[PDB]
């Protein structure tokens, strides 16, 4: 009864939420996770992702100077009224490093425009890239219209999609992601703090990601935290206050770590099984996986994890290509399969 208990999910004071394991992708808890909502400043997570991809590709460096044009002039564009701003002015020459902290830490809407023009030539072209990555990441309930999320009546996202964008930031552009844990930066002699109050919560190891709030959106937060090498991501959208979005996210993250653990039973290239092969330059095939296996299981139950496999075909016949799928690995707890992964040929076996 205790060994097999399924924990109850805490009550969460928000319109929608999700909690996922970064490594395994397992959804630990969810409510209304696919409902389309106003992302508010969470849009800037995708702005950051695009910029991160550009820097990873070597298109520009953090020390490069960006010239501010009239479109990023904070007090020359009333669309920016009442929003977070660096107070950029035309003709300033600001390092990429400062602008990306403006976007990431301050949600500076002017900074978003300046970087969009720098990275992609125009705001429209940059939004094109944002939406291209929406497609590349397989997000079903997300669409962007502007680089900052202002003036975007037809933009939307969801708790799931914002958690998945978080996952992508951490996984794909780690140098960009590393900025989100910074508690402050200085621009024009003015120190600017991070709005993610969970960075100061000494009871968790939170290192990201993004907050947002409007009247339509309510209070939004995408958070990520670690306990050792285990990492969870929470997205809470339509929270009720500044303090509530933090508190509700903390509830989810803490619950996740208490009841679940991530395990890595198999890495790419490690032989899991072997089987005879016919017609080959070797007599047996080495079989395993083509992507590292991470599972999320009930905490404490690693000892009870069992694995076995099935083969698609009666016989293996050479030629066998590297990563050729030949079966399925079943991971089991309490005599029930909880996870399956493709079983693949680890080394090509040509005909003899």
UniProtKB/Swiss-Prot annotation:
One of its GO terms (biological process) is proteolysis. Removes C-terminal D-alanyl residues from sugar-peptide cell wall precursors. The active site is at residues 41, 44, 107. One of its GO terms (molecular function) is penicillin binding. It catalyses: Preferential cleavage: (Ac)2-L-Lys-D-Ala-|-D-Ala. Also transpeptidation of peptidyl-alanyl moieties that are N-acyl substituents of D-alanine; a beta-lactam + H2O = a substituted beta-amino acid. Its main location: membrane. The keyword Ribosomal protein does not apply. Its EC number is 3.4.16.4, 3.5.2.6. It is a peripheral membrane protein. Belongs to the peptidase S11 family. This is D-alanyl-D-alanine carboxypeptidase DacA. Pathway: Cell wall biogenesis; peptidoglycan biosynthesis. InterPro entries: Beta-lactam/transpept-like, Peniciliin-bd_prot_C_sf, Peptidase_S11, Peptidase_S11_C, Peptidase_S11_C_sf, Peptidase_S11_N. Changing residue 181 to R: Complete loss of enzyme activity. No effect on penicillin binding. It is found in: Cell inner membrane.
């Amino acid at each position: 009864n205790i060994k097999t208990m399924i924990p109850g999910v805490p009550q969460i004071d928000a319109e929608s939420y999700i909690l996922i394991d970064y490594n395994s992708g397992k959804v630990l808890a969810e409510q209304n996770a696919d409902v389309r909502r106003d992302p508010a400043s969470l849009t800037k997570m995708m702005t950051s992702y695009v910029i991160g991809q550009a820097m990873k590709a070597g298109k520009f460096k953090e020390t490069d100077l960006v010239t501010i044009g009239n479109d990023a002039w904070a007090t020359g564009n009333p669309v920016f009224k009442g929003s977070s701003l660096m107070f950029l002015k035309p003709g300033m020459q600001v390092p990429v490093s400062q602008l990306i902290r403006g976007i990431n830490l301050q949600s500076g809407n002017d900074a978003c425009v300046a970087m969009a023009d720098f990275a992609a030539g125009s705001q429209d072209a940059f939004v094109g890239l944002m939406n291209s990555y929406v497609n590349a990441l397989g997000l079903k309930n997300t669409h962007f219209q502007t680089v900052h999320g202002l003036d975007a009546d037809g933009q939307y996202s969801s708790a799931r999609d914002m958690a998945l964008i978080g996952q992508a930031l951490i996984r794909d552009v780690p140098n960009e992601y590393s900025i989100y844990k910074e508690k402050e930066f200085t621009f024009n002699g003015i120190r600017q703090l991070n709005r993610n109050g969970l960075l100061w919560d000494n009871s968790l190891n939170v290192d990201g990601i993004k907050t947002g709030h409007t009247d339509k959106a309510g209070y939004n937060l995408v958070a990520s935290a670690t306990e050792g090498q285990m990492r969870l991501i929470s997205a809470v959208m339509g929270g009720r206050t500044f303090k509530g979005r933090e508190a509700e996210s903390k509830k989810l993250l803490t619950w996740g770590f208490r009841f679940f653990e991530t395990v890595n039973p198999l890495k790419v290239g490690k032989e899991f099984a072997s089987e005879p092969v016919w017609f080959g330059d070797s007599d047996r095939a080495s079989l395993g996986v083509d992507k590292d296996v991470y599972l999320t299981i009930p905490r404490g139950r690693m000892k009870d994890l069992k694995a076995s496999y099935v083969l698609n075909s009666s016989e293996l016949h050479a030629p066998l290509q590297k990563n050729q799928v030949v079966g399925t690995i079943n991971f089991q707890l309490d005599g029930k399969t909880i996870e399956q992964r493709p079983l693949v040929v680890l080394q090509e076996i040509p005909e003899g």
